[PDB]
């Protein structure tokens, strides 16, 4: 089917420039324009601009002088570049495609790229087990999890047993600590009788720091 | 630029009820309005185009109407999968603009939390920091109190809470309260207790451990 896959999230220093790649499939950039939309806390959804089938670009007015969109039809890539970012340029950036070649009803979206504008440094998390016990087992159900501590910036992805375990998973919103680093926990409830039979692994991935950790979580 | 005003900011309904979202435009935009759904951690999903026209793959319970300045997206029988924010978009005038969204929350029966406490791991203790985690799982409604006591001393200012968005299947929330202290402070004390207060509990629930046993 139609798909748009964006490059990974990450940090950009203030007054520096942002670059995202959108790789499309299931259609040809020669037949459809690709639009760029961002979503921020301050301004919500903003349409930024578009590159059309034949290479022309339109940019939303407040961005004409710091926005550049280019593409490579053969490689099915669209390249978004935006100059001199400030803190309020922190947002989820998306590429999108309309239903028809000339229109703006966005039926296909990329997965979004969270861009953080900040002067700080990237830092991978430490992953610590939240071990099941009796103080976490009632009625035959055990709770267990992973503490994903001290990383920057957002986001971090957490899955369980390489994607095979989804039922009963809660991955909490990250909270910013006084250190300026994020921390979160991811929990799952499972039958306590399965704790000696099944392995439970939280797969943690902090793409901004290329930190991938698999943490086995065992009864203590 | 056309300004789009969505109202109210929050809607709260019970499953099976009908719900309407309003999107008003600063001047007439004909029927050039598109609606989107955003679920937790999602990108927008196109629900309706041009005020009333269906989109392939979208459940028939979604519909929209309106023309001129006053537009309405409707769900004729809400389901828990519909927990999301809803946005309108105008494209009668360049540049295309979006409204600020309406949040759709679901009501359900009271569900008391299951409470679990997790001591700090020996791994984390090697780093000189101790995190104590108190989990409140699968409850409704959102309001809850977590009180930390270390050796009967009330703990204040040294814990942080996080609440999930509403579950798309059972409409519950879960909450984590993390008490953080230095390894030195953690080693100088014995009884770690979080106390949980919730409408669904007939008295507070205390989970505790002694550092060690």
């Amino acid at each position: 089917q139609v798909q748009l896959k964006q490059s990974g999230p990450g940090l950009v220093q203030p007054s520096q420039s942002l670059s995202i790649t959108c790789t499309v499939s299931g259609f040809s950039l020669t037949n459809y324009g690709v639009h760029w939309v961002r979503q921020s806390p301050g301004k919500g959804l903003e349409w930024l601009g578009v590159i059309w089938s034949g290479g022309n670009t339109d940019y939303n007015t407040p961005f004409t002088s710091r926005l550049s969109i280019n593409k490579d039809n053969s490689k099915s890539q669209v390249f978004f570049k935006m100059n001199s970012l400030q803190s309020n340029d922190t947002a989820i950036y998306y590429c999108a495609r309309a239903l028809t070649y000339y229109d703006y009803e966005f039926a296909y979206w990329g997965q979004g790229t969270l861009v953080t504008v900040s002067a700080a440094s990237t830092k991978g998390p430490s992953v610590f087990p939240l071990a099941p016990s009796s103080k976490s087992t009632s009625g035959g159900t055990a709770a267990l999890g992973c503490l994903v501590k001290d990383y920057f910036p957002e986001p971090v992805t957490v899955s369980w047993n390489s994607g095979a375990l989804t039922s009963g998973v809660h991955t909490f919103p990250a909270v910013l600590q006084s250190s300026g680093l994020y921390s979160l926990s991811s929990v799952v409830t499972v039958p306590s009788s399965s704790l000696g039979t099944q392995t439970y692994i939280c797969n943690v991935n902090h793409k901004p720091s290329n930190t991938k950790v698999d943490k086995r979580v065992e009864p203590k | 630029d056309i300004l789009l005003t969505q109202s109210p900011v929050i809607l709260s309904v019970s499953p099976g009820e009908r719900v309407s979202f309003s999107c008003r435009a600063s001047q007439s935009i004909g029927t050039n309005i598109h609606w989107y759904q955003q679920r937790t951690n999602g990108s927008p999903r196109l629900l309706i185009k041009y005020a009333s026209e269906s989109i392939s793959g979208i459940p028939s319970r979604f519909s929209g109407s309106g023309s001129g300045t006053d537009f309405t997206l409707s769900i004729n029988s809400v389901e828990s999968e519909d927990i999301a924010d809803y946005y309108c978009q105008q494209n009668n005038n360049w540049p295309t603009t979006f409204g600020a969204g309406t949040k759709l929350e679901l009501k359900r029966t009271v569900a008391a939390p299951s409470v679990f406490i997790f001591p700090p791991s020996d791994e984390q203790l090697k780093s000189g920091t101790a995190s104590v985690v108190c989990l409140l799982n699968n409850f409704y409604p959102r309001e809850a109190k977590v009180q930390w006591k270390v050796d009967n001393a009330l703990q204040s200012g040294n814990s942080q809470e996080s609440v999930t968005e509403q579950d798309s299947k059972d409409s519950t929330y879960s909450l984590s309260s993390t008490l953080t202290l230095s390894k030195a402070d953690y080693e100088k004390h014995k009884v770690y207790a979080c106390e949980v207060t919730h409408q669904g509990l007939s008295s507070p629930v205390t989970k505790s451990f002694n550092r060690g046993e």
């Binding site: 979503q39 921020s40 806390p41 919500g44 922190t90 947002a91 989820i92 979004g112 969270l114 957002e154 986001p155 919103p173 990250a174 | 900011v9 929050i10 955003q38 937790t40 951690n41 999602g42 990108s43 999301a84 924010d85 600020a100 969204g101 949040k103 968005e165």
Partner: peptide, 12 residues
């Protein structure tokens, strides 16, 4: 309300 970058949801 206000958009939350962590959850992609409005926080009111």
């Amino acid at each position: 309300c206000q958009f939350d970058l962590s959850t992609r949801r409005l926080k009111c």
